[PDB]
Design an enzyme around this catalytic site. Structure first.
Site, PDB file in Angstrom:
ATOM      1  N   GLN A   4       0.771  -1.109   0.059  1.00 57.16           N
ATOM      2  CA  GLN A   4       0.018   0.202  -0.029  1.00 57.16           C
ATOM      3  C   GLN A   4       0.904   1.400  -0.042  1.00 57.16           C
ATOM      4  OE1 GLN A   4      -2.291  -0.748   3.720  1.00 57.16           O
ATOM      5  NE2 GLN A   4      -3.634  -2.375   2.444  1.00 57.16           N
ATOM      6  N   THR A  43      -2.464 -13.175  -2.831  1.00 56.90           N
ATOM      7  CA  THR A  43      -3.834 -13.256  -2.675  1.00 56.90           C
ATOM      8  C   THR A  43      -4.468 -12.690  -1.542  1.00 56.90           C
ATOM      9  OG1 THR A  43      -3.436 -15.841  -3.058  1.00 56.90           O
ATOM     10  CG2 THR A  43      -5.845 -15.120  -2.365  1.00 56.90           C
ATOM     11  N   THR A  54      -9.379  -2.581  -0.103  1.00 51.85           N
ATOM     12  CA  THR A  54      -9.196  -1.538   1.281  1.00 51.85           C
ATOM     13  C   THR A  54      -8.666  -0.168   0.784  1.00 51.85           C
ATOM     14  OG1 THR A  54      -9.283  -3.242   3.064  1.00 51.85           O
ATOM     15  CG2 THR A  54      -8.237  -1.043   3.488  1.00 51.85           C
ATOM     16  N   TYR A  94      32.151 -14.961 -11.333  1.00 48.12           N
ATOM     17  CA  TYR A  94      32.620 -13.667 -11.445  1.00 48.12           C
ATOM     18  C   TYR A  94      33.762 -13.943 -12.690  1.00 48.12           C
ATOM     19  CZ  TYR A  94      33.872  -8.607 -11.889  1.00 48.12           C
ATOM     20  OH  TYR A  94      34.292  -7.568 -12.466  1.00 48.12           O
TER      21      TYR A  94
END
Ligand code: ZN
Ligand code: ZN
Length: 1102
Positions: free
Chosen positions: A82, A101, A107, A850
């Site tokens: 959010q 989920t 909301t 690397y």
């Protein structure tokens, strides 16, 4: 602080500021000349210089007010999901709700609309079923004040409330309008005319039932259908389209999609609102994979009474499934089935009425389209490893089997002409039934060859994963843990399946013994009852920055990319994990470099010290020219199609606001550190929470263990790059200027490091013919030949002294950059540049570690990968864990996954992994062998020392005759020679020639030399050599050697007279040495910049 400057860094005026101010987040010395002021927005206003900092101020204002609104209207604080959405809503950005989920999508949608209604702006929230339209309004009415105009509409509306809404919609200046998806599809034109500042959508799949909905939504945020049409034509054309900049739309938000966003209309979102309607790819799992060594029906019962409830069974076929349903039913276990009642028998286990559900592979694996409850499924049992089986006889053997065999045999090569009946015909006439299997088993490496049942078993990693991930989903912040138990005794199957799971899912399947059942169940059920509990959510967002898209190409290949936000000059991906959201994108190269114009070619000097001045980079896409100076047209071809890196830097500033914690994962060298600083310093006025991580394995493990060593920007490494960048810039411009005033050409001198090498090449041609000695080849009867000083004529070799001993041979340390170049540019017809280029692709894809090191160290992980391979190949007892080095800066070049080069070819042609060439595979093979050679048993041999008299002259020749015991020689082969009796041997034939004692150069001999001499570093090795080819100082011949061109001879000869102390090896090595001590912080930074400066002025006088 490194005392430098950036030409477009300032958060305020958007221009020149120092490296010491921007770090503190302060504007430049022009905007705010105050050293350490109390406030910025206050002081900038007090100086009448407040400009762009206003945006980042009111941003945090409207956010903290929004966060205050949620806190006061709703319960606790925002979630990480959010908090990311909130920062996107205040900028006014449209986006996709990338979330698991139900984290609280519905909301958030209300609190935004309410917070926007409080400002005065109006919005509309759309939900599928009409049952949601009420509950949305039900919570809305009992929340907001009397001020907000809340209206609703649905199918089963009242008789008079139905018309009460539609008049208010056409007239009454509403605030929040909640209606169904049915409404949007039917009442298209009504909505299209009106405008919303915000549009919330729940089920995006319900909306995407038509194209009349996509056009509507776009018109529902202030976009004329005129623009849409022109946008609809360009996405049809074959490329992308750009919206009119003066157009200022609303804020549209959509949720994750169940199916795929298929069509052309969804592309309108990407080009009109800069966001892609994505679907939820949630590969966020925490599963422990254990394997039982045999299909013991008694042992399954032992496990079913450890789990008791919430267990799943996966049988190979309906046959052996029904069998297990019979057996367990006699033991009175709550057990059902799927092959019969796909619906009823499922819903029973969903309640708890049944404890165990037996299923199949293609029956339940295809009947998983309904709900899939990850809070019931705690355990998953595999009665037989999921796989496909093909019987090999006359026929029945599939086309791809007869293909690859005859592809290597030779009869299907005719344009790979595929046939069903013809491939049967080819078999009988040429290969007998026994001959056929021996060929298949010899070709198909990686899969399982069952000559008993004449079947081919290929593990289904896809089916195994899907059946496994049904016990691990992110439910309410917490990520529940499932347990997968496999029942397979065929060791070839279990190992073949475990390989492709460590390749795709990177999850270790372990044996039964090394797993505590009662301990695993605990952390499964406790994790389960924590997901249910009143969660104090702790999910958060994360930004990660790399310098190469290829790194990001594979970064998303193990994270679970769900969407792609094309934000300006870059494209940022976001994925779903257990720590919340995770954003990541590439820079596609550097960002800053010295300005060619002012100063000492980009260097200012104030207060006694030196100050570098940097600028944004622009790489043209047409011609390809690269420059720093701010221009609109490329000063080479005049193409406006340029690539301004400042549009990337400013792009990252936008994204830096949204994410919480930001991490920079670049190349763990000084070049990747210089970039890591130009970004952190840029995103420091913006964000103040930015750290550094260094990745070596582009996988799950190499990423995790990179954050386990998270640090801040080591200024020594940054200083190191600067001193070296300054070096070849200062000297490189001086010496090249000497060439302009002689040979005419402009850009030539690459510097000092590349020029000293040419010195060896010129004087390698000189001392070449110096050692042209006469030699003779002496072919021996019954024995091997050998070469000696020529012009001999007696045809007889006499053995004088002989002695045998048993020596034990140890292998050679793993590849470095010096090693993986020479021994691969040798064994393959490749140049040092092409070799190194392939290496980078192998590292930045997650196949090797690397590829730019000088250490030989191999960690325990490296040694464990080696052993797990030898235990797979069958020879685990030939393993010897070699540490190789105590002082290990990085790690030696090694394969990150226990998979041989032939097992890789198989996976590609099988359809799992891809993006590889043969030039890649032979380079992986060359390394895979070398590392595993450097991690195997020592070879106990038996070599002799033969002293033979030929033409009155003695000679000592040592050779291996027997290999008493095997070892590492299985990988990198060992050459044995025939024995020598103490008798007289005669010479069959003689070949007279005259090779040199002092030979010539190759691309490998140069790297070989400038490693011993100490000229250059692993990163510079491939560059320097190829650079000589580029300028035209060096040519190749028949043996593909290295000789100085007519141009290359004159250039170096010129320098040795007038500029010798600048290009001498004894001084070149002395610089790289000293600069390497700056890298560790032993010699002062500003000191080595004065030393580079001092020799320059003396050079500027000759
Ligand atoms: Zn400024
Ligand atoms: Zn150009």
């Amino acid at each position: 602080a490194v005392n430098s400057k950036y030409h477009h860094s300032c958060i305020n005026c958007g221009g020149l500021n120092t490296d010491e101010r921007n770090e503190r987040g302060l504007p430049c010395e022009v905007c705010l000349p105050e050293d350490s002021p109390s406030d910025i927005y206050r002081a900038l206003l007090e100086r009448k210089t407040l400009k762009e900092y206003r945006f980042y101020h009111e941003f945090w204002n409207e956010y903290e007010d929004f966060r205050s609104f949620f806190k006061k209207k709703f319960g606790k604080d925002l979630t990480g999901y959010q908090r990311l959405w909130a920062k996107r809503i205040v900028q006014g950005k449209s986006f996709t709700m990338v979330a698991p989920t139900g984290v609280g999508k519905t909301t958030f949608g209300m609190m935004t609309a309410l917070w926007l209604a409080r400002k005065g702006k109006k919005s509309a929230l759309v939900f599928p079923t009409v049952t949601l339209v009420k509950q949305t309004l039900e919570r809305l009415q009992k929340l907001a004040d009397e001020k907000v105009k809340i209206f609703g509409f649905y199918s089963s509306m009242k008789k008079e409330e139905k018309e009460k809404f539609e008049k208010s919609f056409e007239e009454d200046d509403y605030h929040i309008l909640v209606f169904s998806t049915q409404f949007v599809s039917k009442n298209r034109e009504k909505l299209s005319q009106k405008r919303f500042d915000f549009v919330f959508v729940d089920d995006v799949d319900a909306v995407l039932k038509a194209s009349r909905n996509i056009d509507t939504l776009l018109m529902m945020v202030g976009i004329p259908e005129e623009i849409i049409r022109k946008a609809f034509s360009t996405i049809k054309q074959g490329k992308i389209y750009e919206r009119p900049k003066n157009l200022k739309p609303g804020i549209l938000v959509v949720s994750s999609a169940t199916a795929k966003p298929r069509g052309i209309r969804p592309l309108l979102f990407r080009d009109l609102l800069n966001f892609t309607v994505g679907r939820l790819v949630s590969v966020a799992r925490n599963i422990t994979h254990v394997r039982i060594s045999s299909r013991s029906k008694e042992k399954l019962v032992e496990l079913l009474e450890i789990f008791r409830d919430g267990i799943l069974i996966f049988a190979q076929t309906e046959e052996e499934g029904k069998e297990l349903y019979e057996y367990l039913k006699r033991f009175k276990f709550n057990v059902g089935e799927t092959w019969s009642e796909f619906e009823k028998n499922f819903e029973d286990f969903k309640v708890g009425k049944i404890n165990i559900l037996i299923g199949v592979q293609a029956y339940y694996g295809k009947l998983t389209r309904g709900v899939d409850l990850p809070e019931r499924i705690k355990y998953v049992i595999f009665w037989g490893t999921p796989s496909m089986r093909f019987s090999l006889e006359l026929d029945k053997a599939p086309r791809f089997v007869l293909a690859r065999v005859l592809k290597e045999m030779g009869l299907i090569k005719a344009q790979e002409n595929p046939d069903v009946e013809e491939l049967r015909k080819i078999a009988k006439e040429h290969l007998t039934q026994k001959e056929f299997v021996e060929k298949v088993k010899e070709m198909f490496r990686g899969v399982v060859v069952k000559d008993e049942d004449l079947e081919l078993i290929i593990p289904d990693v896809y089916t195994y994963i899907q059946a496994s991930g049904r016990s691990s989903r992110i439910l309410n912040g917490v990520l529940v843990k499932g347990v997968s138990v496999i029942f397979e005794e065929d060791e070839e199957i279990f190992e073949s399946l475990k390989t492709r799971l460590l390749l795709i899912a990177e999850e270790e399947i372990i044996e039964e013994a090394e797993a505590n059942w009662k301990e695993l169940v605990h952390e499964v059920e406790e994790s389960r009852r924590r997901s249910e509990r009143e969660l104090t959510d702790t999910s958060r967002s994360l930004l990660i920055i790399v310098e190469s898209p290829t790194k990001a190409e594979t970064l998303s290949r193990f994270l679970g990319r769900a969407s792609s936000r094309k934000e300006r000059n870059i494209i940022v991906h976001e994925a779903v994990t257990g720590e919340g959201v995770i954003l990541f994108t590439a820079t596609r190269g550097h960002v800053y470099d010295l300005v060619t114009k002012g100063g000492i070619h980009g260097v200012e000097e104030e207060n006694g010290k030196f100050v570098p001045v940097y600028n944004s980079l622009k790489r043209c896409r047409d011609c390809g020219y690269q420059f720093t100076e701010d221009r609109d047209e490329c000063p080479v071809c005049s193409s406006k199609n340029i690539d301004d890196k400042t549009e990337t830097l400013r792009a990252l500033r936008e994204i830096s606001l949204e994410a919480d914690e930001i991490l920079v994962a670049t190349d763990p060298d000084v070049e990747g550190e210089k970039i890591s600083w130009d970004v952190t310093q840029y995103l420091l006025p913006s964000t103040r929470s930015l750290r550094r991580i260094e990745m070596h394995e582009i996988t799950r493990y190499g990423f995790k263990k990179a954050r386990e060593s998270v640090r801040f920007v080591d200024f020594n490494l940054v200083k190191a790059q600067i001193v070296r960048r300054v070096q070849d810039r200062w000297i490189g411009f001086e010496l090249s200027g000497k060439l302009q005033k002689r040979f005419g050409r402009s850009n030539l001198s690459a510097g000092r490091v590349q020029s000293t090498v040419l010195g060896w090449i010129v004087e390698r041609e000189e001392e070449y013919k110096k050692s042209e000695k006469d030699f003779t080849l002496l072919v021996l009867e019954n024995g091997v030949n050998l070469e000696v000083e020529g012009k001999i004529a007696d045809d007889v070799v006499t053995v004088v002294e002989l002695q045998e001993a048993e020596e034990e041979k140890n292998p050679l340390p793993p590849y470095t950059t010096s090693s993986a170049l020479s021994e691969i540019s040798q064994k393959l017809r490749l140049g040092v540049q092409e070799v190194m280029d392939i290496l980078q692709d192998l590292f930045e894809k997650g196949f090797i570690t690397y590829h730019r090191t000088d250490s030989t160290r191999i960690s325990l992980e490296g040694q464990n990968v080696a052993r797990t391979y030898l235990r797979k190949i069958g020879k685990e007892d030939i393993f010897m864990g070699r540490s190789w080095s105590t002082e290990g800066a990085h790690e030696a070049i090694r394969p990150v996954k226990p998979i041989d080069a032939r097992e890789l070819e198989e996976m590609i042609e099988e359809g799992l992994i891809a993006d590889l060439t043969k030039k890649h595979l032979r380079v992986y093979e060359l390394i895979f062998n070398r590392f595993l050679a450097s991690q195997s048993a020592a070879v106990k041999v038996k070599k002799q020392i033969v002293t033979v008299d030929v033409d009155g002259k003695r000679m000592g020749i040592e050779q291996i005759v027997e290999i008493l015991r095997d070892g590492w020689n299985l990988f990198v082969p060992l050459t044995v020679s025939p024995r020598f009796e103490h008798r007289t041997y005669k010479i069959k034939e003689k070949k007279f020639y005259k090779k040199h004692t002092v030979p010539l150069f190759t691309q490998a001999s140069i790297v070989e030399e400038m490693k011993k001499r100490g000229i250059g570093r692993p990163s510079t090795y491939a560059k320097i050599v190829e650079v000589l080819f580029r300028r035209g100082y060096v040519y190749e011949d028949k043996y593909k050697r290295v000789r100085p061109t007519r141009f290359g001879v004159m250039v170096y000869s010129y320098l040795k007279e007038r500029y010798e102390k600048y290009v001498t090896e004894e001084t070149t090595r002395r610089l790289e040495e000293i600069m390497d001590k700056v890298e560790r912080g032993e010699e002062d930074y500003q000191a080595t910049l004065r030393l580079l400066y001092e020799e320059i002025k003396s050079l500027m006088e000759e």
